[PDB]
Amino acid sequence: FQICKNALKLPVLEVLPGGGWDNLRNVDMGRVMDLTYTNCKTTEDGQYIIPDEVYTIPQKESNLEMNSEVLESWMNYQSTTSLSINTELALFSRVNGKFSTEFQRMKTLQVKDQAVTTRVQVRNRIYTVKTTPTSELSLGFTKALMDICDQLEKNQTKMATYLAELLILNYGTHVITSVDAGAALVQEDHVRSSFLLDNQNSQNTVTASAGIAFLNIVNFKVETDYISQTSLTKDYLSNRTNSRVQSFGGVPFYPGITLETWQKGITNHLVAIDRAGLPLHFFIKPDKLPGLPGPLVKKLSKTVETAVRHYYTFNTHPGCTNVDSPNFNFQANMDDDSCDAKVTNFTFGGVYQECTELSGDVLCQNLEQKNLLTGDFSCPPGYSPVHLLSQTHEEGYSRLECKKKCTLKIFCKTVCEDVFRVAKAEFRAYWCVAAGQVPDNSGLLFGGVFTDKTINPMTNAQSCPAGYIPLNLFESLKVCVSLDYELGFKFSVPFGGFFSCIMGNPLVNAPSLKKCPGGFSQHLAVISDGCQVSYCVKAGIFTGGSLLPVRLPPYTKPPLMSQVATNTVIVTNSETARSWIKDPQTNQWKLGEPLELRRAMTVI
Amino acid sequence: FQICKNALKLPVLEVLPGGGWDNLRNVDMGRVMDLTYTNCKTTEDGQYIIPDEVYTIPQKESNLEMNSEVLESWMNYQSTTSLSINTELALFSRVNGKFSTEFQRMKTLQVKDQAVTTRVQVRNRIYTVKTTPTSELSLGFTKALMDICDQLEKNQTKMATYLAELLILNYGTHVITSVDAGAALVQEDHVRSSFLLDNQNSQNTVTASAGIAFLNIVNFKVETDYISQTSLTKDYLSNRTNSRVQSFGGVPFYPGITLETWQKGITNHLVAIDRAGLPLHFFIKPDKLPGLPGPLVKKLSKTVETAVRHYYTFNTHPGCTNVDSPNFNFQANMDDDSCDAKVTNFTFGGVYQECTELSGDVLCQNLEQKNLLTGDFSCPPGYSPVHLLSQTHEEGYSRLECKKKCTLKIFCKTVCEDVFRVAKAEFRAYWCVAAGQVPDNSGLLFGGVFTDKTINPMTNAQSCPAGYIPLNLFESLKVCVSLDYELGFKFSVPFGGFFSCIMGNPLVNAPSLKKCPGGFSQHLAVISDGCQVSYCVKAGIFTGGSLLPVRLPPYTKPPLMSQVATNTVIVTNSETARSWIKDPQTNQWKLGEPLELRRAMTVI
Amino acid sequence: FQICKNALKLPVLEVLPGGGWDNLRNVDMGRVMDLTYTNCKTTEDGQYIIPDEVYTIPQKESNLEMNSEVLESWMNYQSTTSLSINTELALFSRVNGKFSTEFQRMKTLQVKDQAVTTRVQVRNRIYTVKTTPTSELSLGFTKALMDICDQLEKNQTKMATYLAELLILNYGTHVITSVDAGAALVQEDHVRSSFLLDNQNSQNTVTASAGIAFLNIVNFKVETDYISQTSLTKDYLSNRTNSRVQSFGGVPFYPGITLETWQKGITNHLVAIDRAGLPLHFFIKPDKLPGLPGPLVKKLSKTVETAVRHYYTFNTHPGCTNVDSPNFNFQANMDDDSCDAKVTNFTFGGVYQECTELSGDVLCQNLEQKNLLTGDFSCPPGYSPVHLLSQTHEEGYSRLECKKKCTLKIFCKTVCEDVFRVAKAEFRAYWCVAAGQVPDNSGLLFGGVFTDKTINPMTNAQSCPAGYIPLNLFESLKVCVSLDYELGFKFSVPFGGFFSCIMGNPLVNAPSLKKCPGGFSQHLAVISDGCQVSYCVKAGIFTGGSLLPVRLPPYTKPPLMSQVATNTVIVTNSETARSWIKDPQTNQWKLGEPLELRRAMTVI
Amino acid sequence: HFFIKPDKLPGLPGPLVKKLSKTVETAVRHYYTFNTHPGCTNVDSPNFNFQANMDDDSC
Ligand SMILES: *[C@@H]1O[C@H](CO)[C@@H](O)[C@H](O)[C@H]1NC(C)=O
Ligand SMILES: *[C@@H]1O[C@H](CO)[C@@H](O)[C@H](O)[C@H]1NC(C)=O
Ligand SMILES: *[C@@H]1O[C@H](CO)[C@@H](O)[C@H](O)[C@H]1NC(C)=O
Ligand SMILES: *[C@@H]1O[C@H](CO)[C@@H](O)[C@H](O)[C@H]1NC(C)=O
Ligand SMILES: *[C@@H]1O[C@H](CO)[C@@H](O)[C@H](O)[C@H]1NC(C)=O
Ligand SMILES: *[C@@H]1O[C@H](CO)[C@@H](O)[C@H](O)[C@H]1NC(C)=O
């Protein structure tokens, strides 16, 4: 786009709608649109140039909120940088933006201080920039798309999902279509809930005081002299906690910039104020990719959909988030009435595993372990076996076969042959529940849980407590269970249930959703081939504390190539008489009846 | 248009009438007009150039409303950015602009604070820019039009509607014809209804105080000194809540800009102040598209009409919106006298489903489920079966058939054939109503509802309450029904009725409109192939709370190609002796008698 | 990139996401991306140019935190220079940044003064710069990658791990993908915990005082006059310890720079504010390196993974870090409930070694030593032998063989032949534990430990205490054990247990994790061929004191070439029919069936 | 001594470079031990050695 800047001496449009966007991480991950500047299309005013596949409608509407916008609960989270994306009725609208760099701070300021958040935003959005419907894709994005297509062609349903998760990590969860270019001047003013409970009838005065304080802090730079200083403003400042005036656009903010010099500061600076986009799985349509065939593009879109879904469900964590309730879970984003649900107590029953291995019995015996009570895969008397996960495990083993041909024993040289013998071993995890009123003595007491990735919240380290035996559940899931009841009673915590991605725990009252009852705090334990297993515990002190970080894709190490690579040179549909033949090129699909019939007669 | 800027050193007209416009989202979605600058046609003053297919009549009328414009109820919603579009007698004039970024804030400020909105607008509209009647269409818009035409040609009545909904998402619901270029300076000053009830005879003084406060806040930048400061102004500021001075045009606003420097700021900035346009389905006329045939263009216009209708009815939600009434529904946009209607109570009867599948019985048994009371598709004694939806469901299944030809067992290679076996399974949902005075013990109690898309407002999460069995209605509609009466009485809520897009519930008193009686709050449940099904519940606390977000098109995942693609090379009319023959090109329709008769003799 | 600076007179983007990043050392080690400037791609504003394989999304969001951010405990460590990397759920998220130049100072200020840290940060991040997914690698990084590949090809599994550790030392542990270019103005204000315990209800005032003090120190440069000076500010300054206003970006900070001149100072200066990247072992994918084969790249990635793991576990040290507890370990980064664990006391049992040498018995007898009590490899009565390490040791011996051919005894000249006879000697270390209640008289008392690398914390020098015999454990591990009980009782310290990388000590209660019980402080002793052995001691005064420095890779001297170099010209997979043939070039892998079958028939 | 690796010097052979690195290592060691002097460095103790750098509990 440098040729257009040379021909037209004016800065390029700063924020562009072309490119992927992540709802959780709250950042634009990658570029999904090519956005060529072959023709120097500019904004209707001589200020910014725009790519050819993007049109802009200049709104240039500047608002001056004289009073603050109060957010009582943080479940809504009317976000600043993206209000039209964190609000859509997506797969999960509640956790649409609950992992942002802004919402994390807002949450740690709202629950740890019992203080609602009030913002005084001055958003002078300049351009509502939008993508042209007939826009192409960027070379990197379409290259990753074609790579996922070729990997779905080679019957690698695990490697294709892994590459889709990598694409989401590199291109977000939503393709931005609309974006409100402009600037913002927000003061995320958190104020105690008791200040609103004492001024519920005078909330208008609270909002007015917040707004005038924002205004006089922006312009004056002097804290001893402000405008409209009253007693209620002093009480507001006294009940005020963690004030921060954040200018999302324009020249970087300081308490000295008069709002005239701030609004005039928007001449080159134009940041996304209200970006709105559709999910990327919906963006990849059969007409969007001309060379790639229709049904294959639809299968790839379904793969991207299920990968975005695995991203969402693994990222979000269900649990009550009511500040006053005792079973309040701080880490949870999406809240159900678990804290309000009747509290109970369950006795854990133990876990065992089965080995079904090809060869080399040393590797599956590591993941295989028996019960603590009985010592065998049989369920303890009085409990019911519940299935958790039925998938295969494999790790690569590098073997090199060397045969040396040595003449006169001085020309001796070693030449080898690298062989990678990936061994697959089926593994299944089972855990039982007290379906009957069995004695609590037999009831194993859950003491904690840890693997090499997460940290045991009870011990604050990747370690097994004293007196407990580590039980390897799948590969590295080390559950710590008490060999006896009393000596491990003070340290341990009542169990909540083990539920996985395919099958849930029966503890919720015969339908049983993938959740733990009795107001127990749920946490993730292990991810395995795009499937999660979760542990739930009593809502104690260790359930809260720190905020859970954002889990990022991919959710598995690169799956090894167990299946052989396939070349689906011919693609067919049973519904319609539509086919697609692969040319000698890598990705060049063309319609032809003779070639199709010939290659079909050859393959079958 | 850069050649005209080089030849004539002056900025281009900022806002243009060419382009689509969405009534609900309140933004210009896409460009429907080409707007070529082949001839450098300018405004009659040397300030802005205009496209060749657009003429402008300069009004340059500047108004200074010294007093505010009060809006008692928000049902009218005289919008700021578009007053001539949100007022037309369209398909739904009440919800014409009820999903705007402005109206949402106005509503949350009007009902949550019981405060009417008053605006002091200074709209100096400069140019009443209008489109030439003999104007062509943009390449992207006409390309999407031709795509919808070709898809209606291939007998894909579902994919064509999906592409029409996508076009509406990309080109809005109204093609703008007139637009009032200019700037605005509005103060959306919300003031309590009690302040107007106490000053009903002195509303003129309230409006004067609002206007003078707007004026002295715009110019002075000093809050301690204003002009015409009286006691009534102080009472107005005391009863004032969420003031915001929003300048829709010109240089971005700040409390320091004297209105002289604001009005002089309009030299390059020209935003749409009063945009007026006709719906896009009416814009696509037989004479608008020369190559595309007449009756096919009319069928495409009817498709766009029904798609805009599906957009509207799915977006809008009917329910009483009277602040004082107990059955007030906050989310509802269009209001009938439901809250004033006589309150009742109905006992829910249960839902069952039928499977009619081609092959592979595993997929339809997921959507098929029996009654909770009886356990069979038979209606419970004393109830009447009511039909909800009769449409087919299908999901794609990717199957690849591989036959390997391996010589010496070392040249072994796998070559497959991608086959997509879309399986269609007819599904029908039925729910019964207590036509007679049946016991309430048998009457199933509605506990809530959720799918993978929406969120259960009772549980605030996508989850089934404890003690309830999830009932899959169509694909993912998981209704939670109580197995017993008492234990689930405190959590559940009296039912309101299930009504779908094709058939409504008989609960409204034998004609039965698609609505729920007794002042019950209505909400959307599932969209399926452009058809909506709705659930209605007692107007409790959970019905209000947050405002319902804007539902966006398309209202279904891309429908799979079940029907075979067709090439209607010949098009005929039974009324008139008019035909249209397809040339070897993609879209090139030409009149010819010999070609028509020959190809007709060949096809039939 | 100088051609783009000549064509476009503007500074290059200062911080770039391309390049490796070390989590522990908290610095960008090396460059992992080539970042060519073949096309002069610039930022969307005329301020900075960017490499072709890097795109930037300008956020330009400037925040002004009016109140401080309090960190009660230093276990979370929300870092300033990298908040999105020290938070990810990596192999070890607790020690993700516990070896930074910032965290070391924060720790020595937090525990030695019992003072929590509060920061008032002004981070005006300008560009969220990100790497293109289809980006190549830098010549040096890909050269080191190819070197590790060739060394894994030559069956040097130790030299390959050594080169991987060297690469991590030269390219960090994480490949940066996202980076928030900008500036920061942070005041790491440490304040006593008693000041927060006395103002727990008034923590908002403490944060406000910290923020206003930051603001008035930044701008005024005069310490006698500040704004908003109250009594609580004076109490804050009285309880204040080690204040430091650190500007991470922009023009270097001084108390005179008004924040206007600081924010305006960001025109060329752009430092990483929030850098986010994935681990480098995950960055090296089969598609990232085209020439290098797939399974070999996967094996190299596993080698880099295990080398990063050895870096992490050797760097981190587990031990309780609770300030109030008596068993507080200052050096420990990751904390378990060891201090809270029941305190015990164990009697050390002694160490012996075995020699299994090829030839030249002088070298293994140095590492071999018998027990002090018994004087033989037999375990003392009442103890249980525990294995520590089973690996081979070797050191190079240079021998030159000279035979002189001298004519007339005056032409006499010496010509030799350098021969390097690396001698490998197997060595095993065993140490016993009092499995039974043996007398304490026989129980050897652990007096200390030292080698040539670390320093004995009891003697503060590499020396053996008087009256103790040095016991060489592996090569240089000189454990000092008491020959008697009483005379060495005052100097010595109760033992905690010897646990190594492969096998742990059985002192933790038959599973025994690699840890020491009873709240004993753990320290590293010796690293040997990528394996660590650790000694644990009673949590006394000498366990704290100074902070442990950062252990840096490689964790072994260059392993001698014991195994012969191999040329795996052919690489094969047993799962898929995929192979890779080496061309006469160094690293040029190409697919061919005839060449593969021929060379396979030749090698086997 | 660690910087001089077999790959750092291409012309010079591997084992000879390793022997030279061991020579540089032992020379740096002779530099260190000859430079440093062990002795107690506690100001209050009577046997305080001022010249000593590294301190053991000799005093
Ligand atoms: C394709 O992958 C699936 C899933 O692992 C497997 O069941 C099937 O046998 C594979 N087919 C071929 C031809 O590799
Ligand atoms: C909040 O304001 C009330 C009003 O007087 C005051 O009594 C109270 O002390 C304030 N709280 C704080 C924490 O300053
Ligand atoms: C066209 O579509 C309709 C609606 O699905 C269907 O009834 C009809 O059989 C189809 N005709 C052809 C020729 O595909
Ligand atoms: C509104 O104005 C009346 C007039 O005196 C006053 O009594 C009342 O307190 C005001 N309400 C608020 C909320 O300030
Ligand atoms: C390769 O190295 C391994 C590990 O030291 C050794 O066991 C094996 O014998 C070596 N093979 C060759 C051919 O050098
Ligand atoms: C901390 O502040 C309190 C409040 O008066 C004061 O009593 C105390 O002396 C202060 N501590 C220090 C170390 O200045």
Residue numbers in the entry:
A (entry chain P), B (entry chain O), C (entry chain A): 31 to 539, 548 to 642
D (entry chain B): 311 to 369
Tell me what the authors wrote about this structure, in their words.
Perforin-2 (MPEG1) is thought to enable the killing of invading microbes engulfed by macrophages and other phagocytes, forming pores in their membranes. Perforin-2 (PFN2) has recently been identified as a novel and critically important component of innate immunity conserved throughout the animal kingdom and evolutionarily close to the last common ancestor of the MAC and perforin-1 (7, 10). Because of the presence of a canonical MAC-perforin (MACPF) domain, PFN2 has been proposed to form functional pores in bacterial membranes, leading to bacterial death and control of infection. However, unlike MAC components and perforin-1, PFN2 is initially synthesized as a type I transmembrane protein and found associated with the membranes of intracellular vesicles in which its large ectodomain (consisting mainly of the MACPF domain and a unique P2 domain characteristic of PFN2) projects into the lumen.
In this study, we provide a detailed framework for understanding the role of PFN2 in defense against intracellular bacteria, showing that it first assembles into a pre-pore state as a ring of 16 subunits, the pore-forming transmembrane hairpins (TMHs) of which point in the opposite direction to their membrane-binding domains. The pre-pore of PFN2 has a distinctive hat-like appearance in profile with the MACPF and P2 domains arranged concentrically. The larger MACPF domain is located inside, and the smaller P2 domains toward the outside of the ring of subunits, linked via a truncated EGF-like domain. The PFN2 MACPF domain is closely related to the equivalent region of perforin-1, with two sets of transmembrane hairpin (TMH1 and TMH2) α helices prominently displayed available to form a β sheet traversing a targeted membrane on pore formation. As observed in other MACPF/CDC proteins, such as the Apicomplexan perforin–like protein TgPLP1 (17) and the pneumolysin pre-pore, the MACPF domains make extensive complementary contacts with each other in the PFN2 pre-pore structure. However, the CTT region of PFN2 (A577-I642, colored orange in Fig. 1) threads back from the end of the globular region of the P2 domain, passes down between the MACPF and P2 domains, and folds into a two-stranded β sheet on the top of the MACPF domain before terminating in an α helix. The folding of the PFN2 polypeptide chain from one subunit onto the next generates an additional stable intersubunit interface absent in other MACPF/CDC superfamily members. The outstanding insight from our study is that the TMH membrane-inserting regions of the pore-forming MACPF domain are oriented in the opposite direction to the membrane-binding region of the P2 domain in the PFN2 pre-pore. Given the pH activation of pore formation, we suggest that this pre-pore arrangement holds PFN2 in an inactive state until the correct endosomal pH is achieved to facilitate effective killing of bacteria by membrane perforation.
